[PDB]
């Protein structure tokens, strides 16, 4: 059955897990967390402690400010990921790990649209392959590698499948995409999750890995976001049968993403995600 999550909009202590299933109405079947890449697992461990006593699996997406994908490539990172891969492995419960995602966007800085241009499907690619190549020298066989992509490609070279590193390198692919509705003064549109989905999915369908909707959301404003959760949340049961997990990107931040961003969105979210 289709795993429910969220980033709750905070970092997941016990209480901010607790609250959203309050929210919900429902267990939290997989919790996500940001981190960059000057965190320690130890900063970690006590939210990780927190997902693993609620039963849920913790997905972290781990964003490297600190390094680009020459960087990583080069080795540069590598005291760093080296450490994380030790850690884990002796914390031993299974991790979901996101490392130096959207990379078809042009947002982030080892992003391949990124606009210095430092990054390539080739630094990506070996970059990528670096980091899960440490983690299994040292064991940490219980970490799980997601690839993920943007709905859109943005920016100049970016696509959905030129940074893939691999199927041997990848547990999971995963989409991330926003109905932004009006919101944006630069021209945003209403857009359904077939709208917003259907394209990066069609690519990653290509792929004999399982998908996570690793980051959606939806706006108020532009259309109706009650209905529009009812319809994304059957549209990922009905045709996008090889997504495992929704999950959520609960946050007031560029528009507001909750659930609870008017009674009727909660109302409806409720409801969508099932019993299971
Ligand atoms: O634009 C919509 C979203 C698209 N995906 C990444 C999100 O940004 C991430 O948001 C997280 C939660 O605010 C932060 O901790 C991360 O540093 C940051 O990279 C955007 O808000």
Redesign the pocket.
């Known amino acids: 059955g289709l795993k429910i999550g969220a ?1 709750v909009g905070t970092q997941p202590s016990e209480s901010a897990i607790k609250s959203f299933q309050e929210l919900q109405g429902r267990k939290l079947d997989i919790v996500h967390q ?1 981190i960059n890449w000057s965190t320690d697992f130890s900063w970690v461990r006590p939210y990780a402690d927190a997902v693993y006593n609620n039963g849920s699996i913790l997905m972290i997406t781990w ?1 490297p400010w600190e390094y680009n994908t020459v960087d990583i490539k080069n080795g540069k990172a590598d005291a760093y990921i080296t450490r994380m891969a030790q850690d884990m492995k002796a914390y031993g419960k299974e991790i979901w790990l996101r490392p130096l995602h ?1 990379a078809n966007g042009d947002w982030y800085p080892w992003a391949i649209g990124y606009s210095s241009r430092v990054n390539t499907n080739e630094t990506y690619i070996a970059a990528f392959r670096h980091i899960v190549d440490i983690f299994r020298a040292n064991g940490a066989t219980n970490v799980k590698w997601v690839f993920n992509v943007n709905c859109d490609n943005v920016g100049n070279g970016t696509s959905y499948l030129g940074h893939y590193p691999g199927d041997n390198y990848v547990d999971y692919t995963s989409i ?1 995409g ?1 109905n932004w509705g009006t919101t944006q003064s630069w021209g945003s549109q209403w857009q359904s999750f077939d709208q917003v989905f259907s394209r990066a999915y069609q690519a990653l369908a290509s792929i004999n890995k399982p998908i996570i909707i690793a ?1 959606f959301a939806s706006a108020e404003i532009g259309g109706n976001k009650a209905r529009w959760i009812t319809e994304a949340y059957n549209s990922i049961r009905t045709s996008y049968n090889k997504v495992i997990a929704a999950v959520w ?1 609960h ?1 007031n ?2 528009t507001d993403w909750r659930i609870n961003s008017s009674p009727e969105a909660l109302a409806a979210y409720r409801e969508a995600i099932g019993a299971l």
Do not use: A
Request: hydrophobic share 25%; net charge negative.
């Open positions: 980033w940001f964003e959207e991330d926003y980051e990107f946050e931040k560029e």
